[PDB]
Amino acid sequence: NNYDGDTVTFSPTGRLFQVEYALEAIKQGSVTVGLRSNTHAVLVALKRNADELSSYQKKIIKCDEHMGLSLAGLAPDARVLSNYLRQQCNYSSLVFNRKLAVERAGHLLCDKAQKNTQSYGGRPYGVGLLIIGYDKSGAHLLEFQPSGNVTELYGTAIGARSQGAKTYLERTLDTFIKIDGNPDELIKAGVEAISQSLRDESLTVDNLSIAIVGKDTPFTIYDGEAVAKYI
Amino acid sequence: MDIILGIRVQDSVILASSKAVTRGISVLKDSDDKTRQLSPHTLMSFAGEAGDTVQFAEYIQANIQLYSIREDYELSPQAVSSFVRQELAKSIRSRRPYQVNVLIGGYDKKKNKPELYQIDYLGTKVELPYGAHGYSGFYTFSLLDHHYRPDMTTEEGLDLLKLCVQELEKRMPMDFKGVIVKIVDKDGIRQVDDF
Amino acid sequence: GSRRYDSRTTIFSPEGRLYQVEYALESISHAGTAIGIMASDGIVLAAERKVTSTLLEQDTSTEKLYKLNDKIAVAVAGLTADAEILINTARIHAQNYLKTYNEDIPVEILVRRLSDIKQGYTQHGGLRPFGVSFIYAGYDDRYGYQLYTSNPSGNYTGWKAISVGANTSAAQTLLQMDYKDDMKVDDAIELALKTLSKTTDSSALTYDRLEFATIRKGANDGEVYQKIFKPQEIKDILVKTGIT
Amino acid sequence: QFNPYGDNGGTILGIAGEDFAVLAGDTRNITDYSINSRYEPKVFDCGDNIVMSANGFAADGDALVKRFKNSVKWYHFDHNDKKLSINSAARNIQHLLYGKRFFPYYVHTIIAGLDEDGKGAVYSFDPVGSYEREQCRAGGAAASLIMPFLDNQVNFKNQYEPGTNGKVKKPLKYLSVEEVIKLVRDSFTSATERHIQVGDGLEILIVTKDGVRKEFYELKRD
Amino acid sequence: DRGVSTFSPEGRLFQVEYSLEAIKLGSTAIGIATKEGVVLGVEKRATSPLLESDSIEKIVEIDRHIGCAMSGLTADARSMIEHARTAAVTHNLYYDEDINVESLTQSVCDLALRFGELMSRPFGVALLIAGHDADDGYQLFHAEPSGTFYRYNAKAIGSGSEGAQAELLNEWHSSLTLKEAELLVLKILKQVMEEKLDENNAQLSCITKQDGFKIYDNEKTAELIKELKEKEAAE
Amino acid sequence: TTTLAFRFQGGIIVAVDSRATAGNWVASQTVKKVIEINPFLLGTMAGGAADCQFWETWLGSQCRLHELREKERISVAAASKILSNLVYQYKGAGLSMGTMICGYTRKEGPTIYYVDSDGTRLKGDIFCVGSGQTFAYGVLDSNYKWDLSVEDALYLGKRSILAAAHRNAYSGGSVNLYHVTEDGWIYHGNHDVGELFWKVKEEEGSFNNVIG
Amino acid sequence: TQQPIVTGTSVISMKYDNGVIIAADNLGSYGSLLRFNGVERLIPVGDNTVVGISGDISDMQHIERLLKDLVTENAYDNPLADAEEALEPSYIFEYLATVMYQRRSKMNPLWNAIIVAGVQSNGDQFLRYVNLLGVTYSSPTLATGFGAHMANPLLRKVVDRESDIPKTTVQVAEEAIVNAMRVLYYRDARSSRNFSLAIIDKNTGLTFKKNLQVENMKWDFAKDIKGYGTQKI
Amino acid sequence: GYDRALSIFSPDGHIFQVEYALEAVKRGTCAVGVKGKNCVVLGCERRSTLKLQDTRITPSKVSKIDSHVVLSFSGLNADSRILIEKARVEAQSHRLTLEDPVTVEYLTRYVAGVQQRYTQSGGVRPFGVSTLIAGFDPRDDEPKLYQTEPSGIYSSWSAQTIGRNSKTVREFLEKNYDRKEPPATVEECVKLTVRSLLEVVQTGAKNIEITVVKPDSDIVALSSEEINQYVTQIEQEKQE
Ligand SMILES: *[C@@](C)(CO)[C@](*)(O)[C@H](CC(C)C)NC(=O)[C@H](Cc1ccccc1)NC(=O)[C@H](CC(C)C)NC(=O)[C@H](CCc1ccccc1)NC(=O)CN1CCOCC1
Ligand SMILES: [Mg+2]
């Protein structure tokens, strides 16, 4: 009310309203799902269009050969954060000849988002990210929120009606976690998960967006006729 | 760049500047005009380091032309020469100084008098009846000391100038390919085409 | 952040006016009146000191009339402290010009630069404008005797006779009535004092409440002299015109 | 006074065929009269069917290759995984080199691959970025030994058709991958014989539309 | 007052949303993409009859293979075009090749959100960026001040956009010829324009692989306008 | 290097050799010393290969940005001055460039500008640039007339490079010919000195110093 | 622009079937003065890497601090700091190689020659060299300074190429290293008798041996040598 | 540095600071530009509440940017000086690098670009100025007349007016100016310009300024008597 003019102001109950309004931008964004087993990690994203004449907004971005994310909310903010991740992954490779740990990737994003919530003039990032990767400790899935909070998960979902997919994964947890050495089945579980967040619309060939990374699989994105298999 | 001469007579200033542009063992050009018009009644000749000469001349030209537009008024030769000197005086203590020597021949319309200023790359200004830069002066000064008179006409000044060029063509080691002569008077600046 | 406390000094009103410039002019309208009158053989500067106290040291005082160089002077109306900032800048600018061209600065060039500084404070920087209006009196070999005025907007204009400060409306009407083009300095001196005497908010105009100056070619042969009047000299000129 | 440059020796060689290109280089690394390594590769697969070698001062050579490899990576990120053509790579490398015009990379750079018509391509660079496409180029310590031999055997220079009174030149033709590797091996054994900084091993990278293949051969170790 | 980079309770940037209202006040601009080329057309909208309409430059070249149309506060587009042209030429210098249309659009859209308390406010202009490259062929992009860009088969921006977009929805198909697209822009422009459409108050342009980006002459467009009227009366 | 360009009745002839050296080591015989900036503008290269190659391709980018911004092809004067002002910024840094900006516009007509790395910019009708410039001058000047035909002018430019290619050790390889007209530049082929010398010797009867 | 003041001489090393061996004497020379005798020039990083350093000792101590800080930084927010995400020899080397080249490129080098010896997580032997110029190379045997001239020839007789590595045991490899250190003591005027030796094995781990001495030296033949030519007495 | 975003969007999509800058232009004295067949004429109003003025030294309303281009304006007088100075500097800079004087379009585009920059730069307000820029391109005889405004938009005009009561004089020009046949001579062009100002001005004494620009840097300002002759001629023809 009187405490939402900028990010530098606390409310009387200790809330940061600009951060909460940034969180609100994610809820309006199109649904995207993340889940992993022990061998692979999968991103599934429902892309959104302006109208039938327009293209479908690309949700998934590659950060390195072993890491990438999906976005929900302000796409330009995802571009800034993904670019930062690309540089950090790259710095780790050039300087230390070392693939960046997915956990450090999350710590770096957390700290970058945080600085924007404590200083005057700036604004919080208006996007949520689901980071997947495969590093020296196996497969990983992270959930980034622009408040700064990063959380490692077996599976999750963000965006509009994400609660449906999140409930499904909470039920299916014991099943999909053990899908080891089988990419197509892990994707199927992710495609069935995102289907629980659909209303009136269904998954078409230029609507669905899938990405995967794993043990002997570089981070690769599937769009167009390459996802027709999973419909 | 080598030979630039200046002679102030009764009612005009005459500048003579060599036409040769030499690089190494090759005369690249024999029709080079080593001068810029700073204003309708002010002319500046120049000589020195390659590149610096033209870059400096045009920079001054732009500044004087800017002043003329702003004030709708022509700066006096004295004022222009003081501006030029200050620029060179700044330059000599810069990271890379302009290695350019200039003569400024102008006609002051308020005083109705011709004026010749000699300024070297250090920012050393002097008003003179006749001037020269480089090795030219080692011949022409003594020659002009003898033959020059303050009440001479423009035509007498041109004959006096011919006497300088002839001496330079006789005793100078390098072939400077003749000179372009320009006259500055009450009616402005004009070029002598046959010299 | 700090946005909360920003007055926004350099913005337009809905009517297209600059708030701070208008309010600075309102401030100047309460300042002691200053009059400039340009004659064919010189310029007169006359200014009324702001409600003088009897214990004020009058002879070693300078409130209204300042010297910029040997050929140019100014009469001030508004905040004196603001004026002195601008005066020192103007003095330096005149010396920069002399150093560069070996010639005394033309009056308009000095006025334009000083007015450009004022303009800057109205368009950028977020600072309040200078609450000062000047009357420039000066001479050069191009235009001869010249009178200008500048105000907080940074706009300047040339005049034959002009007033700034308090009661300019009444003062300008009186000047417009009695001024003529073939006027002499001595006549202009009389007009300046008569105008102040009528427009003043004081009971009677006296020597101790005035500053006076002339810029004549009254020196020996083709050269300009600046005369900042002494208290006794103002006392004499006030008697000579029959005001006291 | 500290001297920021050094000479790591070695020599490299690029030959272009009709539908292939090779980039060879010896594996010896030296300083002064000492051998640092008998097997230190300096010919690298940089992705997008581009092979590269920057011979001379190895520290600068490694830095350049490292920066170009990174340039390829970011080219994919910024331009929707578009394949970096050999001509585009060459121009990019010019800017990398010329970027340090006043503190140069002390290397002779050669890249090899296929052009956009599928034909074999070799580009060579001087230390400050001047580049040129050629059928043939040797670089490094023994370049002065190998290059004239390549002019004679690859481009058939000074060779005329027998009995034509030195009037008809020997006609230009593409060489097979088998014939090119013969010339590379003979070039390096000859250079090994007469140049002290060349020897130990020969590593050849062959580029076709199918990918990047490697071949290794022993050289004299004296 | 309030911060420039402030979020509303709904989760949108106030200034970005307000700039979108300014774009709705702008003159109409329509783009249609086909397999034979991309067509760009604009409403000039001269404020007075004394204004020389040919000086109204709302269609602009970025490179030989990329063109651009604008709508909204058109003065704001100048620095966007300048950046686009430099980006296009700079890439050619670095890589000895034409730059992808998408990459060019992305470079322009990176400027968009570089505002706050960088420039003082978002751009008040939307751009239709049309071009061709070897990889993705003929393309049309809509670049907004939000920093977002969508690819479109056909797109209208400006005051008559929602009406024109609904019309483009029905009329567009994947087998449109270049000539058919030209007439379709003129048809839809004439519908949404206030004043009557002619060669002086409307401008056409196109980009083809062969001839590159070309702004049509008033003589060429006048014939297409005449061809359009005859075809509508013919049934 | 040896390069030249001269103005005549039928426009401009531009001729260059193709050799590149590193000391006494002949590094290349097939270098392109003419840069095609646009259909009406050419640039010649002499001195530091990288310096010339890099900055003249950069010049082409600047000339392109001009015609996008101004909707008009850049003048030869303005093009040459972009380059001269650029190298002047680097004066003393050690750039080595001897260039000629040759082209045609409506307002200027056929125009040649000499531009070098120490800041010199000269308009003129005839220039020869490079270590072999003097050898080219000798043949060019002694045979030059304004009223040369396009055929004779092309040959004289070719013959002048050949002369320098022969006498100067740091020039050779092949001759590249260009002809600039009101309609733009026209390429007139690559001519290898290996065959050209003997062809010229036999047909012309010149080069009697050489063992035939 | 520097000049080295207090210096350390040769660092020598080689690969063997299960790991690597590295050695360096304990001397800190001050020109011709053999100033400091308790200087440790082998610095372990974790339980899988040993960095041997020669050249300027002040710069060596700076590098020690960097490596020490690298271990600290790696532990931050890293639950697997003593397991999968522990510092590898390849990470440590690339870091140093980056620093060495950056410093030479700023015309202010770390005046050192460095050999990073260790064993990777997958069991592979790691041995690589880097110096003040940022020059890097790897070989079955590596040595710095006089070691390059005298030790390498001896160590290469044991492991002359890659295929000789599996055939070389830790006993044979250590014997050659210890022999090389003796030869360096005979012939290098800035060497000492006291030295340290480190073995990094993929099975037995890191074994750090301090206070070793050169022994079994041949000096007896010196008594027979009289004069410089003719002299009989 | 002062960073505040003064020019910003409002809910309805307007930038009030730019629109309020237009109100300042609307307050300013009237300025008119009319281009004939071989010339351009710039007419300017001068308000007559200021007597005892010195017209020798008072800044003229029309300013020369170069020998071939002129600039008049309406709005804040102090603001105009900054644009004029920048334009004059750019004119000399263009001659220095391109070796050719600016085109009228280029000079306009520059001035318009400066005005635009001040509408989305932090810490500054827009210029309260609209300009009429007129002249002839080098080696060209086609007349050029351009207008700029605070927002930064610019465009070419056959004839145009700006300032106070400009809508009245624009109404006049819209019916009196023929595109097919512009003023064939200098006299015709000046007369139409004076006529248009007489719809608004008051008296045709020392209130109207006229500046005529012709090809090849031929610019001249008319005196009082010269202008008064047009005023006397128009009034006599009016009484009919
Ligand atoms: C005639 C041939 C006279 O030179 C022409 O002027 C040609 C002009 C054409 C090529 C544009 N000029 C040259 O061939 C030019 C001559 C030259 C050499 C050095 C400085 C100035 C002028 N040659 C070069 O520039 C060569 C071209 C290479 C061989 C393709 N380049 C070099 O010599 C380079 C780079 C020189 C350099 C300049 C500035 C900073 C750093 C370096 N140097 C080497 O290649 C060094 N060297 C070669 C032999 O192996 C050891 C390393
Ligand atoms: Mg050998």
PDB file of N, CA, C and O in Angstrom, chain F residues 110-150:
ATOM      1  N   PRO F 110      36.027  11.034 -61.762  1.00  0.00           N
ATOM      2  CA  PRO F 110      37.088  10.120 -61.333  1.00  0.00           C
ATOM      3  C   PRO F 110      38.103  10.829 -60.439  1.00  0.00           C
ATOM      4  O   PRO F 110      38.602  11.898 -60.794  1.00  0.00           O
ATOM      5  N   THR F 111      38.376  10.242 -59.277  1.00  0.00           N
ATOM      6  CA  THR F 111      39.222  10.870 -58.267  1.00  0.00           C
ATOM      7  C   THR F 111      40.160   9.857 -57.617  1.00  0.00           C
ATOM      8  O   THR F 111      39.761   8.729 -57.326  1.00  0.00           O
ATOM      9  N   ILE F 112      41.403  10.274 -57.391  1.00  0.00           N
ATOM     10  CA  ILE F 112      42.375   9.459 -56.668  1.00  0.00           C
ATOM     11  C   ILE F 112      42.928  10.247 -55.488  1.00  0.00           C
ATOM     12  O   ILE F 112      43.338  11.398 -55.639  1.00  0.00           O
ATOM     13  N   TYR F 113      42.938   9.611 -54.320  1.00  0.00           N
ATOM     14  CA  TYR F 113      43.545  10.177 -53.122  1.00  0.00           C
ATOM     15  C   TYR F 113      44.646   9.259 -52.608  1.00  0.00           C
ATOM     16  O   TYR F 113      44.420   8.070 -52.407  1.00  0.00           O
ATOM     17  N   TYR F 114      45.835   9.820 -52.414  1.00  0.00           N
ATOM     18  CA  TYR F 114      46.931   9.131 -51.734  1.00  0.00           C
ATOM     19  C   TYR F 114      46.751   9.351 -50.237  1.00  0.00           C
ATOM     20  O   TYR F 114      46.552  10.482 -49.804  1.00  0.00           O
ATOM     21  N   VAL F 115      46.807   8.274 -49.455  1.00  0.00           N
ATOM     22  CA  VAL F 115      46.696   8.350 -47.994  1.00  0.00           C
ATOM     23  C   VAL F 115      47.729   7.421 -47.360  1.00  0.00           C
ATOM     24  O   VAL F 115      47.722   6.223 -47.642  1.00  0.00           O
ATOM     25  N   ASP F 116      48.604   7.961 -46.507  1.00  0.00           N
ATOM     26  CA  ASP F 116      49.613   7.138 -45.821  1.00  0.00           C
ATOM     27  C   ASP F 116      49.546   7.238 -44.293  1.00  0.00           C
ATOM     28  O   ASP F 116      48.830   8.076 -43.743  1.00  0.00           O
ATOM     29  N   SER F 117      50.302   6.371 -43.622  1.00  0.00           N
ATOM     30  CA  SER F 117      50.198   6.207 -42.171  1.00  0.00           C
ATOM     31  C   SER F 117      50.739   7.364 -41.334  1.00  0.00           C
ATOM     32  O   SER F 117      50.425   7.446 -40.149  1.00  0.00           O
ATOM     33  N   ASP F 118      51.542   8.255 -41.910  1.00  0.00           N
ATOM     34  CA  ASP F 118      51.972   9.433 -41.141  1.00  0.00           C
ATOM     35  C   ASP F 118      51.052  10.648 -41.347  1.00  0.00           C
ATOM     36  O   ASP F 118      51.385  11.758 -40.940  1.00  0.00           O
ATOM     37  N   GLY F 119      49.878  10.419 -41.941  1.00  0.00           N
ATOM     38  CA  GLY F 119      48.809  11.422 -41.985  1.00  0.00           C
ATOM     39  C   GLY F 119      48.648  12.166 -43.300  1.00  0.00           C
ATOM     40  O   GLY F 119      47.735  12.978 -43.444  1.00  0.00           O
ATOM     41  N   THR F 120      49.525  11.893 -44.262  1.00  0.00           N
ATOM     42  CA  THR F 120      49.504  12.588 -45.542  1.00  0.00           C
ATOM     43  C   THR F 120      48.303  12.169 -46.384  1.00  0.00           C
ATOM     44  O   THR F 120      48.078  10.979 -46.609  1.00  0.00           O
ATOM     45  N   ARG F 121      47.543  13.160 -46.845  1.00  0.00           N
ATOM     46  CA  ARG F 121      46.404  12.938 -47.731  1.00  0.00           C
ATOM     47  C   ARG F 121      46.496  13.897 -48.915  1.00  0.00           C
ATOM     48  O   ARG F 121      46.444  15.115 -48.735  1.00  0.00           O
ATOM     49  N   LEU F 122      46.639  13.344 -50.119  1.00  0.00           N
ATOM     50  CA  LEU F 122      46.850  14.143 -51.324  1.00  0.00           C
ATOM     51  C   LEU F 122      45.937  13.706 -52.456  1.00  0.00           C
ATOM     52  O   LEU F 122      45.859  12.520 -52.774  1.00  0.00           O
ATOM     53  N   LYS F 123      45.260  14.671 -53.070  1.00  0.00           N
ATOM     54  CA  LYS F 123      44.530  14.429 -54.309  1.00  0.00           C
ATOM     55  C   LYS F 123      45.506  14.569 -55.468  1.00  0.00           C
ATOM     56  O   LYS F 123      46.407  15.408 -55.424  1.00  0.00           O
ATOM     57  N   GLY F 124      45.338  13.747 -56.498  1.00  0.00           N
ATOM     58  CA  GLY F 124      46.224  13.805 -57.658  1.00  0.00           C
ATOM     59  C   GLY F 124      45.803  12.918 -58.812  1.00  0.00           C
ATOM     60  O   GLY F 124      44.870  12.123 -58.694  1.00  0.00           O
ATOM     61  N   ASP F 125      46.510  13.062 -59.931  1.00  0.00           N
ATOM     62  CA  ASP F 125      46.216  12.315 -61.153  1.00  0.00           C
ATOM     63  C   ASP F 125      47.036  11.036 -61.261  1.00  0.00           C
ATOM     64  O   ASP F 125      46.562  10.055 -61.822  1.00  0.00           O
ATOM     65  N   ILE F 126      48.266  11.056 -60.746  1.00  0.00           N
ATOM     66  CA  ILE F 126      49.160   9.895 -60.799  1.00  0.00           C
ATOM     67  C   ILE F 126      49.837   9.671 -59.452  1.00  0.00           C
ATOM     68  O   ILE F 126      50.370  10.609 -58.855  1.00  0.00           O
ATOM     69  N   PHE F 127      49.825   8.424 -58.989  1.00  0.00           N
ATOM     70  CA  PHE F 127      50.589   8.023 -57.809  1.00  0.00           C
ATOM     71  C   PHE F 127      51.125   6.607 -57.989  1.00  0.00           C
ATOM     72  O   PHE F 127      50.484   5.765 -58.621  1.00  0.00           O
ATOM     73  N   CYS F 128      52.309   6.365 -57.435  1.00  0.00           N
ATOM     74  CA  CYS F 128      52.862   5.023 -57.296  1.00  0.00           C
ATOM     75  C   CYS F 128      53.308   4.883 -55.848  1.00  0.00           C
ATOM     76  O   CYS F 128      53.983   5.768 -55.315  1.00  0.00           O
ATOM     77  N   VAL F 129      52.921   3.785 -55.206  1.00  0.00           N
ATOM     78  CA  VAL F 129      53.174   3.600 -53.780  1.00  0.00           C
ATOM     79  C   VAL F 129      53.781   2.230 -53.520  1.00  0.00           C
ATOM     80  O   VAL F 129      53.426   1.252 -54.177  1.00  0.00           O
ATOM     81  N   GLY F 130      54.696   2.172 -52.555  1.00  0.00           N
ATOM     82  CA  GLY F 130      55.366   0.929 -52.179  1.00  0.00           C
ATOM     83  C   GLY F 130      56.864   1.015 -52.396  1.00  0.00           C
ATOM     84  O   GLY F 130      57.365   2.006 -52.926  1.00  0.00           O
ATOM     85  N   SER F 131      57.579  -0.035 -51.994  1.00  0.00           N
ATOM     86  CA  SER F 131      59.032  -0.088 -52.152  1.00  0.00           C
ATOM     87  C   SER F 131      59.452  -0.044 -53.623  1.00  0.00           C
ATOM     88  O   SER F 131      60.545   0.418 -53.936  1.00  0.00           O
ATOM     89  N   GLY F 132      58.586  -0.512 -54.519  1.00  0.00           N
ATOM     90  CA  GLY F 132      58.879  -0.477 -55.951  1.00  0.00           C
ATOM     91  C   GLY F 132      58.272   0.696 -56.709  1.00  0.00           C
ATOM     92  O   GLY F 132      58.209   0.670 -57.939  1.00  0.00           O
ATOM     93  N   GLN F 133      57.840   1.727 -55.985  1.00  0.00           N
ATOM     94  CA  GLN F 133      57.160   2.873 -56.596  1.00  0.00           C
ATOM     95  C   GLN F 133      58.007   3.600 -57.648  1.00  0.00           C
ATOM     96  O   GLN F 133      57.484   4.052 -58.668  1.00  0.00           O
ATOM     97  N   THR F 134      59.311   3.699 -57.397  1.00  0.00           N
ATOM     98  CA  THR F 134      60.221   4.433 -58.279  1.00  0.00           C
ATOM     99  C   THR F 134      60.369   3.750 -59.638  1.00  0.00           C
ATOM    100  O   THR F 134      60.451   4.417 -60.671  1.00  0.00           O
ATOM    101  N   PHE F 135      60.403   2.420 -59.623  1.00  0.00           N
ATOM    102  CA  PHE F 135      60.551   1.633 -60.844  1.00  0.00           C
ATOM    103  C   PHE F 135      59.301   1.759 -61.707  1.00  0.00           C
ATOM    104  O   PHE F 135      59.388   1.821 -62.934  1.00  0.00           O
ATOM    105  N   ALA F 136      58.143   1.793 -61.053  1.00  0.00           N
ATOM    106  CA  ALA F 136      56.870   2.009 -61.732  1.00  0.00           C
ATOM    107  C   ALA F 136      56.791   3.423 -62.304  1.00  0.00           C
ATOM    108  O   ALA F 136      56.364   3.610 -63.442  1.00  0.00           O
ATOM    109  N   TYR F 137      57.206   4.409 -61.509  1.00  0.00           N
ATOM    110  CA  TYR F 137      57.243   5.806 -61.956  1.00  0.00           C
ATOM    111  C   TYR F 137      58.059   5.979 -63.236  1.00  0.00           C
ATOM    112  O   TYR F 137      57.643   6.692 -64.147  1.00  0.00           O
ATOM    113  N   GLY F 138      59.222   5.335 -63.289  1.00  0.00           N
ATOM    114  CA  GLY F 138      60.119   5.444 -64.435  1.00  0.00           C
ATOM    115  C   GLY F 138      59.448   5.107 -65.753  1.00  0.00           C
ATOM    116  O   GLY F 138      59.580   5.844 -66.728  1.00  0.00           O
ATOM    117  N   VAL F 139      58.722   3.993 -65.772  1.00  0.00           N
ATOM    118  CA  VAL F 139      58.017   3.532 -66.971  1.00  0.00           C
ATOM    119  C   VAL F 139      56.719   4.306 -67.191  1.00  0.00           C
ATOM    120  O   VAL F 139      56.404   4.687 -68.319  1.00  0.00           O
ATOM    121  N   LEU F 140      55.972   4.527 -66.111  1.00  0.00           N
ATOM    122  CA  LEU F 140      54.676   5.197 -66.190  1.00  0.00           C
ATOM    123  C   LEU F 140      54.804   6.634 -66.695  1.00  0.00           C
ATOM    124  O   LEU F 140      54.144   7.009 -67.662  1.00  0.00           O
ATOM    125  N   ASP F 141      55.658   7.423 -66.046  1.00  0.00           N
ATOM    126  CA  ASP F 141      55.843   8.836 -66.402  1.00  0.00           C
ATOM    127  C   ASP F 141      56.336   9.027 -67.834  1.00  0.00           C
ATOM    128  O   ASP F 141      55.854   9.909 -68.547  1.00  0.00           O
ATOM    129  N   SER F 142      57.295   8.202 -68.249  1.00  0.00           N
ATOM    130  CA  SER F 142      57.909   8.327 -69.575  1.00  0.00           C
ATOM    131  C   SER F 142      56.982   7.905 -70.724  1.00  0.00           C
ATOM    132  O   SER F 142      57.267   8.195 -71.887  1.00  0.00           O
ATOM    133  N   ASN F 143      55.886   7.219 -70.398  1.00  0.00           N
ATOM    134  CA  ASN F 143      54.892   6.800 -71.392  1.00  0.00           C
ATOM    135  C   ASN F 143      53.498   7.395 -71.177  1.00  0.00           C
ATOM    136  O   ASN F 143      52.596   7.148 -71.978  1.00  0.00           O
ATOM    137  N   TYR F 144      53.315   8.173 -70.112  1.00  0.00           N
ATOM    138  CA  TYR F 144      51.990   8.685 -69.766  1.00  0.00           C
ATOM    139  C   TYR F 144      51.576   9.867 -70.634  1.00  0.00           C
ATOM    140  O   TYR F 144      52.350  10.801 -70.845  1.00  0.00           O
ATOM    141  N   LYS F 145      50.345   9.801 -71.130  1.00  0.00           N
ATOM    142  CA  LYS F 145      49.655  10.945 -71.717  1.00  0.00           C
ATOM    143  C   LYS F 145      48.199  10.886 -71.269  1.00  0.00           C
ATOM    144  O   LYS F 145      47.680   9.802 -70.993  1.00  0.00           O
ATOM    145  N   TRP F 146      47.545  12.041 -71.187  1.00  0.00           N
ATOM    146  CA  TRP F 146      46.130  12.089 -70.809  1.00  0.00           C
ATOM    147  C   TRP F 146      45.246  11.390 -71.844  1.00  0.00           C
ATOM    148  O   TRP F 146      44.231  10.786 -71.493  1.00  0.00           O
ATOM    149  N   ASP F 147      45.650  11.455 -73.112  1.00  0.00           N
ATOM    150  CA  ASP F 147      44.840  10.949 -74.224  1.00  0.00           C
ATOM    151  C   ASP F 147      45.079   9.471 -74.554  1.00  0.00           C
ATOM    152  O   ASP F 147      44.817   9.040 -75.676  1.00  0.00           O
ATOM    153  N   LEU F 148      45.569   8.696 -73.587  1.00  0.00           N
ATOM    154  CA  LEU F 148      45.709   7.248 -73.761  1.00  0.00           C
ATOM    155  C   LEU F 148      44.340   6.595 -73.916  1.00  0.00           C
ATOM    156  O   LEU F 148      43.365   7.028 -73.303  1.00  0.00           O
ATOM    157  N   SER F 149      44.273   5.558 -74.744  1.00  0.00           N
ATOM    158  CA  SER F 149      43.058   4.764 -74.886  1.00  0.00           C
ATOM    159  C   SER F 149      42.938   3.805 -73.708  1.00  0.00           C
ATOM    160  O   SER F 149      43.926   3.515 -73.036  1.00  0.00           O
ATOM    161  N   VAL F 150      41.726   3.313 -73.466  1.00  0.00           N
ATOM    162  CA  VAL F 150      41.475   2.342 -72.394  1.00  0.00           C
ATOM    163  C   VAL F 150      42.394   1.122 -72.530  1.00  0.00           C
ATOM    164  O   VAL F 150      42.874   0.587 -71.529  1.00  0.00           O
TER     165      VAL F 150
END
